[PDB]
Structures are given as C-alpha cells and as structure tokens.
Scaffold this active site. Sequence first.
Site, PDB file in Angstrom:
ATOM      1  N   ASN A 110       0.879  -1.066  -0.011  1.00  0.00           N
ATOM      2  CA  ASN A 110      -0.208   0.114  -0.020  1.00  0.00           C
ATOM      3  C   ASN A 110       1.071   1.230   0.179  1.00  0.00           C
ATOM      4  O   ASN A 110       1.763   1.319   0.695  1.00  0.00           O
ATOM      5  CB  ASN A 110      -1.061   0.036   1.096  1.00  0.00           C
ATOM      6  CG  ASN A 110      -2.004   1.247   1.176  1.00  0.00           C
ATOM      7  OD1 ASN A 110      -2.437   1.469   2.351  1.00  0.00           O
ATOM      8  ND2 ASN A 110      -2.261   1.848   0.136  1.00  0.00           N
TER       9      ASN A 110
ATOM     10  N   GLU B 238     -11.095   8.272   8.578  1.00  0.00           N
ATOM     11  CA  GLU B 238     -10.335   8.493   7.225  1.00  0.00           C
ATOM     12  C   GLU B 238     -11.563   8.729   6.082  1.00  0.00           C
ATOM     13  O   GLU B 238     -12.348   8.246   5.914  1.00  0.00           O
ATOM     14  CB  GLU B 238      -9.799   7.243   6.947  1.00  0.00           C
ATOM     15  CG  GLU B 238      -8.893   7.082   5.841  1.00  0.00           C
ATOM     16  CD  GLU B 238      -8.215   5.966   5.694  1.00  0.00           C
ATOM     17  OE1 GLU B 238      -8.910   4.956   5.524  1.00  0.00           O
ATOM     18  OE2 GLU B 238      -7.124   5.939   5.065  1.00  0.00           O
TER      19      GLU B 238
ATOM     20  N   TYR C 185     -12.029  10.272   1.904  1.00  0.00           N
ATOM     21  CA  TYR C 185     -11.655  10.170   0.374  1.00  0.00           C
ATOM     22  C   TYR C 185     -12.677  10.949  -0.265  1.00  0.00           C
ATOM     23  O   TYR C 185     -13.845  11.048  -0.019  1.00  0.00           O
ATOM     24  CB  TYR C 185     -11.459   8.830  -0.161  1.00  0.00           C
ATOM     25  CG  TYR C 185     -10.360   7.992   0.386  1.00  0.00           C
ATOM     26  CD1 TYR C 185     -10.290   7.103   1.853  1.00  0.00           C
ATOM     27  CD2 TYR C 185      -9.244   7.834  -0.493  1.00  0.00           C
ATOM     28  CE1 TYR C 185      -9.553   6.259   2.040  1.00  0.00           C
ATOM     29  CE2 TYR C 185      -8.232   6.913  -0.046  1.00  0.00           C
ATOM     30  CZ  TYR C 185      -8.502   5.908   1.096  1.00  0.00           C
ATOM     31  OH  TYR C 185      -7.657   5.335   1.487  1.00  0.00           O
TER      32      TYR C 185
ATOM     33  N   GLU D 295      -2.837   7.188  -4.050  1.00  0.00           N
ATOM     34  CA  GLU D 295      -2.636   6.278  -3.618  1.00  0.00           C
ATOM     35  C   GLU D 295      -2.725   5.027  -4.299  1.00  0.00           C
ATOM     36  O   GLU D 295      -3.224   4.864  -5.276  1.00  0.00           O
ATOM     37  CB  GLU D 295      -3.765   5.842  -2.398  1.00  0.00           C
ATOM     38  CG  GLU D 295      -3.866   4.729  -1.890  1.00  0.00           C
ATOM     39  CD  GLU D 295      -5.023   4.561  -0.471  1.00  0.00           C
ATOM     40  OE1 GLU D 295      -5.886   5.235  -0.626  1.00  0.00           O
ATOM     41  OE2 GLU D 295      -4.655   4.050   0.429  1.00  0.00           O
TER      42      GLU D 295
END
Length: 205
Positions: free
Chosen positions: A45, A94, A96, A183
């Site tokens: 990752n 978290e 996004y 990412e």
Amino acid sequence: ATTITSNQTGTHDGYDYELWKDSGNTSMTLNSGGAFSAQWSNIGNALFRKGKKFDSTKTHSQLGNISINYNATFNPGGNSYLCVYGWTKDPLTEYYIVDNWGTYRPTGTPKGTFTVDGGTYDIYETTRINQPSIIGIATFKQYWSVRQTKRTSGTVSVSEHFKKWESLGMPMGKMYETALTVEGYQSNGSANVTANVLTIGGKPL
C-alpha cells in the site's frame, strides 16, 4: 527538486508532504508549492501527498472553508486513486473524495449522492476493524465521495463534501489533515501533480 524513496513526512515549500508505503519501490519528487510527482511498483500500500497537516484541535467549521485546485497526470497501473485524502480524530475517521481511479472503483455502504464542482459524486461509508491508522491499529469509519466520471484536474470543494457527509449522519471530528493524494495498492503506476493549491478560508498555503 528533492526526490525521496522511503517513508518520510515534512514540509516542502509551504506544503506538508508525505511518502508512505508499507513496502515496495516508491519514488516521490517534491516540486514547487503543492506540486509533486511519484512512481511506485511491487508495493503493498502506498500514498504520496502534499497538503496540510493540522493539529487536531479544530473542527473543519472552525478552520474555515477548505478547497483545493489541482492539475495532474495519473497512471493507475492497477488499483490506485487520485483523491483528496485526510483524517479527523475524536472520532477517528479516514476520508476520501475520489476523482480518478484504476481497475477498481471505490465502493461501500451507499449513503447518498452529491453534485458539486461540475460533477456528481457517489457517497459511501465503510468500517475499518483493527486496521492501520494515523494513530496505530484501530477501528474507524471511512468516508467516500467518488465522482461518477473520472477527471485529472479541477476544483474540489472539500468543505462542501464534509458538510454533506454530516447532513447524512456521517460526523467529522477534529481535522488532522487534508491533502491531494495519490494512493496505490499492489499497483504499478505513477502520477505528476503539476498544480495543487490548498486554500483555507480562501487563503493559499
């Protein structure tokens, strides 16, 4: 200007930058302002980004309107995302706001849809049980805004997304960070963010 290849966080030309990977080949070049480039392969990752790391003492409403203007080149090379990424604490969250992706479109518990910045986003929520987090192995919710159509440049009204997530029962804690992010997950790609400006209360970093 400066190129890094291993985990590192700092501030470059006013922007908080970070190269993170659990493993694999990663290269990140730090350019002017919020500009940066990156390439990765044989990774687990990996995240590359430039934006603002906050102190986790203020909620987004106390920071003022947050917005990012960006222009980038992006090669997914598998499962990768071009997005605005960040975290909040108390609660640990978290988030996004995905404008581009590769072979995998981010999905989760459907929660609504939102139209902003010339596009229409799908809103999802997902839960993370004992997964890596900015504070260590922890359990937390993930917030997702995924554009229905891909793009590699434009304006992301970060605060508008936050407000909409909240109106949908998705609470935000104190801001830990907000940054244009690339990412990758076991993908082999690269990206060149030639323009990346983060404004707080309309004021550029």
